[PDB]
Design an enzyme around this catalytic site. Structure first.
Site, PDB file in Angstrom:
ATOM      1  N   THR A 275       0.758  -1.170   0.066  1.00 24.25           N
ATOM      2  CA  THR A 275      -0.055   0.011   0.099  1.00 24.25           C
ATOM      3  C   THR A 275       0.943   1.276   0.077  1.00 24.25           C
ATOM      4  OG1 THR A 275      -1.349  -1.266   1.737  1.00 24.25           O
ATOM      5  CG2 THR A 275      -2.054   0.727   1.084  1.00 24.25           C
ATOM      6  N   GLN A 276       1.687   1.611  -1.180  1.00 24.86           N
ATOM      7  CA  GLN A 276       2.434   2.731  -1.188  1.00 24.86           C
ATOM      8  C   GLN A 276       2.457   3.469  -2.108  1.00 24.86           C
ATOM      9  OE1 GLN A 276       6.049  -0.343  -1.085  1.00 24.86           O
ATOM     10  NE2 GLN A 276       6.842   1.614  -2.032  1.00 24.86           N
TER      11      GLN A 276
ATOM     12  N   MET B  39       0.496  -7.294  -1.425  1.00 27.05           N
ATOM     13  CA  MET B  39      -0.126  -6.058  -1.400  1.00 27.05           C
ATOM     14  C   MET B  39       0.860  -4.820  -1.021  1.00 27.05           C
ATOM     15  SD  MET B  39      -3.095  -6.087  -3.093  1.00 27.05           S
ATOM     16  CE  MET B  39      -3.675  -4.426  -2.447  1.00 27.05           C
ATOM     17  N   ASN B  40       2.373  -5.181  -1.038  1.00 24.05           N
ATOM     18  CA  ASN B  40       3.168  -4.223  -0.703  1.00 24.05           C
ATOM     19  C   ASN B  40       4.294  -4.430  -1.583  1.00 24.05           C
ATOM     20  OD1 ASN B  40       5.178  -3.607   2.166  1.00 24.05           O
ATOM     21  ND2 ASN B  40       5.117  -2.533   0.611  1.00 24.05           N
ATOM     22  N   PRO B  41       4.089  -3.537  -3.003  1.00 24.36           N
ATOM     23  CA  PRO B  41       4.886  -3.921  -3.928  1.00 24.36           C
ATOM     24  C   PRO B  41       6.160  -3.005  -3.642  1.00 24.36           C
ATOM     25  CG  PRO B  41       3.571  -2.261  -4.472  1.00 24.36           C
ATOM     26  CD  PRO B  41       2.922  -2.882  -3.032  1.00 24.36           C
TER      27      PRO B  41
END
Lengths: 233, 122
Positions: A1-2, A107-109
């Site tokens: 989530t960035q 979900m944290n690419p």
């Protein structure tokens, strides 16, 4: 989530008869602020591979670290670390591919687009891409960001399909690469003039050039433009 | 009475830890290896007993590197040594990750000591 913060723009590459070339500029942008002017974004792994990365710099820097460790740990209890069991471009790529798809699935690419260019033990050129979503693909030419739009069309006029690779020379190829780079400086508001280029040839090995500049610039024609239509002078 | 040597953390009446000392014996029953410090480095070397001609020459390496600037050699139960190197490696990485610079030797050593000393506590 960035959300990326400090970023780096395109990375362009193409493979030729006996190797591959790849390049990227030396800028770390902070939105519209061209903030850092000395950022190498081409990462040499060993003697037969260079991995170019675009996207969020902090994540790139993290991938730098992951790459050094990958090297350190391959030396371990490996008598053949500087030979037969040395890191091949494909090994480095599949590793990175794997990480990207795992970070996306969590979900944290790692907000990047990466091209791994190099040559294999047996002499085959290697050029492939993977990005923040784990999407991967390969082609005689490859580029990220604007380079995909601008550079690819150019680089492809030289190597349009596989059969053209054996007919293309380093000179031809490097020429192309530098032109594309110039183009990008003209049309990409986030490009910089300073860049890094690297060639990985099955004979000369790895040549990495630092501090190149876009030259032969056509700006003279700007003088005959005045107004936006009806203005005379 | 006796029995003060059936358990690893037990102090004997003379204040020794018998299992630690029996360990040393396993060491003494092993190949030799040394280390000579020098004016700007260190050298390591070990005897490698040739059990048979069936052994492939120069293959069963014994000296080990930790990180890229540390050599490790040990005599004894080989596997115990390897175990000790895996931790060393892990502890080297942990240090680099957090501090960037590769682990200083004194520091590496202590990391090793502490892990070994820990194996005489339970």
């Amino acid at each position: 989530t960035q959300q990326p913060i400090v970023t780096g723009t395109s990375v362009i590459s193409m493979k030729y008869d006996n190797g591959v070339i790849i390049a990227a500029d030396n800028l770390g942008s902070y939105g519209s602020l061209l903030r850092f002017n000395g950022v190498e974004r081409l990462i040499p792994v060993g003697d037969n591979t260079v991995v170019g990365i675009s996207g969020d710099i902090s994540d790139m820097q993290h991938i730098e670290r992951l790459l050094k460790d990958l090297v350190t740990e391959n030396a371990y209890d490996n008598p053949l670390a500087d030979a037969e069991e040395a890191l091949e471009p494909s090994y480095i790529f599949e590793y990175l591919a794997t990480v990207m798809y795992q970070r996306r699935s969590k979900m944290n690419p790692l907000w990047n687009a990466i091209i791994v260019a190099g040559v294999q033990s047996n002499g085959d050129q290697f050029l492939r891409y993977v990005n923040l979503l784990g999407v991967t693909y390969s082609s005689p030419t490859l580029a990220t960001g604007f380079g995909a739009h601008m550079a690819n069309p150019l680089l492809r006029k030289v190597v349009d399909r596989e059969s053209d690779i054996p007919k293309t020379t380093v000179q031809v190829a490097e020429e192309a690469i530098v032109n594309a780079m110039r183009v990008l400086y003209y049309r990409d508001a986030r490009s910089s003039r300073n860049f890094s280029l690297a060639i990985i040839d099955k004979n000369t090995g790895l040549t990495f050039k630092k501090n190149l500049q876009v030259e032969n610039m056509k700006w003279d024609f700007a003088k005959d433009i005045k107004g936006y239509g009806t203005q005379k002078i | 009475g006796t029995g003060y040597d059936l358990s690893n953390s037990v102090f004997s009446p003379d204040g020794r830890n018998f299992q630690v000392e029996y360990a040393v014996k396993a060491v003494e029953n092993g190949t030799t290896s040394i280390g000579i410090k020098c004016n700007d480095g260190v050298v390591f070397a070990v005897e490698k007993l040739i059990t048979s001609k069936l052994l492939v020459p120069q293959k069963n390496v014994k000296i080990q590197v930790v990180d890229r600037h540390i050599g490790c050699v040990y005599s004894g139960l080989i596997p115990d040594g390897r175990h000790l190197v895996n931790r060393g490696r892990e502890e080297a990485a942990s240090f680099k990750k957090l501090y960037k610079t590769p682990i200083p030797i004194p520091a590496f050593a202590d990391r090793l000591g502490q892990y070994v000393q820990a194996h005489t506590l339970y």
